[PDB]
């Protein structure tokens, strides 16, 4: 389906920053393993993929304090 929108991107970026994680180091690698495509940039996800990643980041951010 269609590419990730800027509101979803900004929600993901907010959570990455809160978690002390990055696209390059953390999330792009994980998305590539989970979705089994080769994802090399944050704008290259689909909206459906991004929503799945955002749900996972919310769980992480809700679970515990960042050390």
């Amino acid at each position: 389906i269609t590419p990730v929108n800027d509101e979803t991107m900004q929600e993901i970026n907010t959570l990455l920053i809160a978690l002390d994680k990055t696209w390059d180091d953390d999330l792009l690698p994980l998305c590539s393993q989970i979705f089994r495509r080769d994802i090399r940039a944050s704008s290259e996800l689909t909206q459906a993929e991004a929503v799945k990643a955002l749900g996972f980041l919310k769980q992480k951010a809700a679970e515990q304090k960042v050390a």
């Binding site: 994680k21 994980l30 996972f56």
Partner: peptide, 10 residues
């Protein structure tokens, strides 16, 4: 296949 619904470390 691991999934975003799984208790994946991050």
């Amino acid at each position: 296949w691991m999934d975003f619904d799984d208790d994946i470390p991050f």
